[PDB]
Design a protein around this ligand. Structure first.
Ligand SMILES: C[S@@+](CC[C@H](N)C(=O)[O-])C[C@H]1O[C@@H](n2cnc3c(N)ncnc32)[C@H](O)[C@@H]1O
Length: 266
């Protein structure tokens, strides 16, 4: 019954999973009660028997390791509320930095047409679309991805400017390749031997982590375009062997996190 007593008991159950256990419980409780984080303030109570059990289930669920954000059915990325669920990779905060680089690149060059390969939750393409006049073409090998991205776009009023199709790389948009000014991706960059609550396709790029990159730069002619993709810490020197002329950016941590091929001409 006692709501805040409950919240303490659960915090402890998540100490080996998260440093911020209390916040996770507050979130879970809020969700289960179908309420806003910020209304959790009455200084007393507010939870019924069946609600109590549900919360305990979900704390159990999370206790094992199951990502928090599958349970919430939601994730903030760029201060926008993105839907997620099993089968969709959950946005990481580092990818924000990528979207912010992409947006300045747009302003600088007045870019109007942008692609997002492996859109996932739609988190990069929708953001770029939401915070600029660009239109975005997005792909993903996964059907869940594409349903979810279409919903997220629609959920942020950019359905008129964010188009998503199932397929690999830009095969479903051969018709638009010409016009694409900027290709964006947070692809799978993890080794096969760096070993999931999230889709395997989303994480790994073979025993190297580079399987995506090799295919991309082999298959596609990037002349006249700009490429900008997130990358694993370690792969800078090997990536320089896949593509030359490429630039590589440090992130907030001061670790290389993005490759940047600018082939946009004057
Ligand atoms: C690392 S997750 C990133 C999701 C999203 N870009 C983000 O950062 O939030 C990679 C995503 O790419 C998709 N994917 C992997 N390889 C792909 C490929 N060759 N073509 C299109 N999509 C791909 C997966 O479906 C997955 O959702």
């Amino acid at each position: 019954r006692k709501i805040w007593s409950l919240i303490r008991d659960c915090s402890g159950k998540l100490e080996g999973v998260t440093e911020t256990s209390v916040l996770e419980v507050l979130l879970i409780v809020s969700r289960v009660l179908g309420i806003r984080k910020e209304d959790l303030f009455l200084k007393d109570l507010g939870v019924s028997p069946t609600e109590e059990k549900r919360i305990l289930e979900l704390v159990e669920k999370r206790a094992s390791g199951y990502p928090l954000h599958y349970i919430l059915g939601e994730k903030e990325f760029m201060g926008l509320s993105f839907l997620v669920e099993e089968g969709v990779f959950v946005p990481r905060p580092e990818t924000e930095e990528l979207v912010e680089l992409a947006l300045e690149l747009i302003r600088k060059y007045g870019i109007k047409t942008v692609a997002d390969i492996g859109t996932g939750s739609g988190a990069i393409g929708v953001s770029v679309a939401k915070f600029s006049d660009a239109i975005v073409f997005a792909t993903d090998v996964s059907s869940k991805a594409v349903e979810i991205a279409r919903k997220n776009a629609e959920r942020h009023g950019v359905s008129d400017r964010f188009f998503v199709r199932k397929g690999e790389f830009l095969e479903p948009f051969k018709e638009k390749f010409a016009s694409i000014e900027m290709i964006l991706s947070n692809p799978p960059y993890v080794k096969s031997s760096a070993h999931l609550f999230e889709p395997p396709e989303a994480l790994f790029g073979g025993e190297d982590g580079l399987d995506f990159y090799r295919e991309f730069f082999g298959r596609y002619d990037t002349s006249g375009k700009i490429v900008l993709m997130e990358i694993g810490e370690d792969q800078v020197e090997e990536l320089k062997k896949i593509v030359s002329d490429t630039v590589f950016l440090k992130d907030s941590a001061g670790k290389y996190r993005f490759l940047l091929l600018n082939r946009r001409s004057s």
